[PDB]
Amino acid sequence: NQIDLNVTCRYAGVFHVEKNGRYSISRTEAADLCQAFNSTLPTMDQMKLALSKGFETCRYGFIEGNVVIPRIHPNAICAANHTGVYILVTSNTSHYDTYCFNASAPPEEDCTSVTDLPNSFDGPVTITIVNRDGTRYSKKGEYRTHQEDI
Numbered sequence: 001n002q003i004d005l006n007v008t009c010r011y012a013g014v015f016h017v018e019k020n021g022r023y024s025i026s027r028t029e030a031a032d033l034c035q036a037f038n039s040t041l042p043t044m045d046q047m048k049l050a051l052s053k054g055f056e057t058c059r060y061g062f063i064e065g066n067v068v069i070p071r072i073h074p075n076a077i078c079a080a081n082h083t084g085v086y087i088l089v090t091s092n093t094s095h096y097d098t099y100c101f102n103a104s105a106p107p108e109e110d111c112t113s114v115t116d117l118p119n120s121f122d123g124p125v126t127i128t129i130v131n132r133d134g135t136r137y138s139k140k141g142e143y144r145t146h147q148e149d150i
C-alpha cells in the first residue's frame with residue numbers, strides 16, 4: 001500500500017508532482033494532493049510567473065481550470081515544439097500529473113529537496129516523496145478525500 005510522489009524544484013512556488021511516475025491523477029485527486037503539500041492548484045497567472053523564473057516540464061498536469069505543460073525551450077516531443085504555457089485542448093482522457101502552488105516557497109528558483117508532506121492526514125498508505133536527486137522522505141498517511149479516487 002504505497003504511493004511514490006515525484007516532485008520538482010519550485011519556481012515562484014509552483015512545482016510538478018507525478019504519482020508513481022505515470023499519468024494517474026484525477027482532477028479531484030490533484031486538488032487533494034496539493035492540499036497535502038499545503039498548496040493549491042496554480043492559477044494561469046501563477047504558472048506564467050513560474051515559467052518566467054525557469055520552470056518547464058515535459059508532462060501534462062492540472063492547474064486551476066486547465067491541463068498544461070510549461071515550456072521554455074522548443075522540443076518536438078514536448079508540447080509539439082511549443083513554448084509558453086501550453087494548454088491541452090483535445091484529449092479523451094481524465095488523468096494527468098498535477099502542478100501545485102505553495103505561497104510560502106522562495107520567490108524564484110528553489111531546487112532544494114522536499115522533506116515533508118505537512119498536511120497529509122492519518123491513513124494506511126506509505127507515501128514517499130521522491131526528489132529528482134533521489135532524496136526520499138516517507139510517512140504513513142492518506143491525502144485522498146474522494147472515494148472514486150481510492
Ligand SMILES: Cn1ccnc1CCN1CCc2cccc(N)c2C1
Nearest residue numbers: 006007008018021022059130131132
Ligand atoms: C519521462 N517521464 C515520464 C514520466 N515523467 C517523466 C519526466 C519527469 N520526471 C520523472 C522522474 C522523476 C523522478 C523524481 C523526481 C522527478 N521530479 C521526476 C520527474
